[PDB]
Nucleic acid binder design. Sequence first.
RNA 1: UGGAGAGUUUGAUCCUGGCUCAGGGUGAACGCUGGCGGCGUGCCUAAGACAUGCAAGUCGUGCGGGCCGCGGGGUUUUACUCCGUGGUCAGCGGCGGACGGGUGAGUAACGCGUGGGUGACCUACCCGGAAGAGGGGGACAACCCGGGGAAACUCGGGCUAAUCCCCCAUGUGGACCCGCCCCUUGGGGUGUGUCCAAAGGGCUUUGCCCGCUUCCGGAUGGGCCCGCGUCCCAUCAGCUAGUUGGUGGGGUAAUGGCCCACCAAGGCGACGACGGGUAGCCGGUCUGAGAGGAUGGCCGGCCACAGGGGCACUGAGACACGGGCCCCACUCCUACGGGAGGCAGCAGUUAGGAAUCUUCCGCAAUGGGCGCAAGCCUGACGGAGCGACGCCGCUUGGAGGAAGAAGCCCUUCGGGGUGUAAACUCCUGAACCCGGGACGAAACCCCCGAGGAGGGGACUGACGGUACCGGGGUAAUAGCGCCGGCCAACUCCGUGCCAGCAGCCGCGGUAAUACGGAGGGCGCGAGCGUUACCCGGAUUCACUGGGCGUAAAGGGCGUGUAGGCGGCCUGGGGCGUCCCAUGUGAAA
Lengths: 99, 208, 100, 84
Amino acid sequence: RNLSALKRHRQSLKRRLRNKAKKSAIKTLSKKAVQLAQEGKAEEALKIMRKAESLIDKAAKGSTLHKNAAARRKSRLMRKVRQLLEAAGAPLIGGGLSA
Amino acid sequence: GRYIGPVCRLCRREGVKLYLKGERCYSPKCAMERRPYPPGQHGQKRARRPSDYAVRLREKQKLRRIYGISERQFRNLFEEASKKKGVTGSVFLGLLESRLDNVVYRLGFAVSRRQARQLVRHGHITVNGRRVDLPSYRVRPGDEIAVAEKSRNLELIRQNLEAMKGRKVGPWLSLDVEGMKGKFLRLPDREDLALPVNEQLVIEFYSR
Amino acid sequence: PKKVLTGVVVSDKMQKTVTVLVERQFPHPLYGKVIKRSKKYLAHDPEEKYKLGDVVEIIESRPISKRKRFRVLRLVESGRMDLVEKYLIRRQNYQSLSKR
Amino acid sequence: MVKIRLARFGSKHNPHYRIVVTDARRKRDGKYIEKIGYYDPRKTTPDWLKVDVERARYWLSVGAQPTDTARRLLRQAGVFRQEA
RNA sequence: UGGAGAGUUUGAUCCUGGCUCAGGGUGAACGCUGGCGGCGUGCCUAAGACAUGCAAGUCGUGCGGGCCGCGGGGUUUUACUCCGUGGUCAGCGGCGGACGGGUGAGUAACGCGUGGGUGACCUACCCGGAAGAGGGGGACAACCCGGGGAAACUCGGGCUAAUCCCCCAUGUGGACCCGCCCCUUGGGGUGUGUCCAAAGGGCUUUGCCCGCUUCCGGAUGGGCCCGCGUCCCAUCAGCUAGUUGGUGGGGUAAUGGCCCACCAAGGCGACGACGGGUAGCCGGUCUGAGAGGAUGGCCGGCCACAGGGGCACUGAGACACGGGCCCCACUCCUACGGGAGGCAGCAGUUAGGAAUCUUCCGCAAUGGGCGCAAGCCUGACGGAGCGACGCCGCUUGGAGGAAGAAGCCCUUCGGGGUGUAAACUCCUGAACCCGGGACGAAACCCCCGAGGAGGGGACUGACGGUACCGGGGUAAUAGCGCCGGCCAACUCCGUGCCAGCAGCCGCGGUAAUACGGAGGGCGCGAGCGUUACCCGGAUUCACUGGGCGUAAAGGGCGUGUAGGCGGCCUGGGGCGUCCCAUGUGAAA
């Protein structure tokens, strides 16, 4: 009949809610970053980066993109951001960016 | 279960008698003396040629018959002879006689093997302390196998005591008529205590 | 104890990738006599520093790729041919066995 | 996590435990690592006291845990004790 | 420290050479017989179906509650509100449900065994150590109102909580990027710019405990990879398009085409690919002189699966037996509107089959869950039950007792055999009553010292009044196969190629030591035989250990590819090879 895996089920549903929504947020923010980046203006993409990385260790914070994938996507993001920057753009505003 | 019945019918079957039923099977007949030679219809027809293997087999039977036991356990302990090292069959005969029933026998306590099994199984015989049942209980160099507290108060016990005297122990079975006891000692063999069965034949037959 | 094999480099056929013709001796856990058999592993040569025949020493590596394991390290001797040559002949004679 | 505990290997009514280190998750009568003890709660023969003093000490050091009657057998083995 | 053979083709012999048996072994089964006990082991076929019962919870030292209740606190009182407060039940909340458990269907695979790599990784739950706990704010249950449903239970508005969800700060340390430094596959220190923390409970209350946040380290486990070992069909000879390789990205914990883009054409094979058939591998087990042959229940390690197949979420950990969704198949429930179930968990049921168990007891021990503990759950586990189902232990009696009874079989009718056998004589005492009677259990807990190390104090038995010890005491189940050679055991009737026997040779065609029966003997003994099934024998796939003149067997001869295998001197190398030292080869 019953169990405590009905409790485990519903719980898992709430946890999935928060997880899903936050992860999706990360995805979109990153997309914003590449938009303004392949454009070629640091500025707002620096704001986007801050928001992004924060949410990234908000993912590491608990049960989402844990440790690596958070950091891995930090790396890959800033990387793909940086390369397109000096391509038709002056890499300024020292944000999540060294020099 | 030790055949049970016409026992010294084997006293004649092997050919030559054995200390079997006790007083009688040693008196003017183990059923022998009177007419020793195998029973049955063919009782005395004209003895044929026993195939070599069958001389061997008849020896196996012979030995396990005098020793008073089925050849099952006998088989197992012959294997134990193969394993426990020594010139197999010798230390075999030894670790055969070391069994408590006939230890009690040659110690001069029981008159006959069957009688022995009864006495020992009923804990009439104690072993170095506790009244050990089990006719099949091998002892060790030093253990003093006695009788029960109610045995000094027993009858054919004193029969055995008095009528035995003037008969020396199997040179390791150090009894007591003074307290009804009996120390265990060294391992006897084919010559320490002899019997009419060629061991080599027995072993060769057995393990084939 | 990263296992390393000493073997005759076979066929430069790919870029950044070489085939390596290893061959090991062995006894015979039944009949005593010794035997021998060839094995082709994946030499990782990111700048074609190796070519036809030249025996090199190969390395138990990070999974470089799909079956492409076993990098390199120390080159050994070149001007080999002859060996790779015989092996080749045997290959053509594999294409000399037909039931069609 | 790891735990130290008692595993029986006696007959149908002949109890006899061993004190051994194993990562808990392992089954009762199963493999272990360090054969570091044995003990019989029936007092068969005066040998019912066995704990590997040294590496049991050092085991409870490295971050391990015991069982119940294990605490018992160590408060007898004195590996617990510092002598005071 | 271990190795034997015989039957069998001839008038007769030697050699050859198959069929046969002596053997040990089994989760066995079948007929005949079958007493107590110990330990063991008991669906091998339908991975077919399963009704019922139980099998995963727990915490109020995480947080608001309805409901049984007490002081009844307010009520000057009312009607009953409401501080306290013993007890039930859901919720949010936290850890477990990824352990434990069953199965061999799949899988010929890096699955397993095995030796290692990971400078490519993951690891809550207990030990180490440094850094720590500023504030504000939000959602939905439970519960409030109303409705529909057979049940499954379901929708809408409305409510307050918190270790529940958050944002700025606090930043040793950590993460990224870009740069230097030593290292050399992503190892490690480091400079500039951004991002990441934290949660409160309980009291013996001003101090301790349980939980906390961050990193580094420990502990164990685990993924990833690699060398080698791992079954028959060559009447399966060519296999392939994510296929082989790269560069560039996704994804993962990370490596890798596992996946995509694109680009270069390789990738593999008689050293036995690709394909069909077959099976979970093993420490080992049984056999065997040895090598080897078989095989893998129980037990232990590793696999993979839950009726078949695909999937994802949660989470430190899973494609998750007893958690969800989906499709197909299948039974099952209903008032037919529409639904629920998965025992290859434990018992038990049903069919299959020649075959294999009680729908039992205890949480008293061990081990697992969670809890400050108290504590509760615990068909893991501990035990009783049923089966000669196997090993072992044991009993159905022990002593004298006849030139030998009676009965029964043989006869040359004198007797011979069953037979110390019997009856009896005594001795004991299977069973079975009266009594007493267990070990299997000292911790956690309480106090002394602080909860630290150490001391005393106290609860804890299913098994079972059984094991066991004392007294008392009754002669009290014996059967199965063989008896022509192999092979120990022969005479007598009936039967007359009919009835039959048979493992092979053959035995019966009216004198059978073979058939039935009967006397007697051999063997075995709570056992006896039968068939089955594997290893032996079988040196009959011969590696120790073989052969091919005429017995089975030399290619119709050449040729020469590959492979195999090589004369004599010298020294270098030290690859096989031998030795030396350890890690390992867990336990059993």
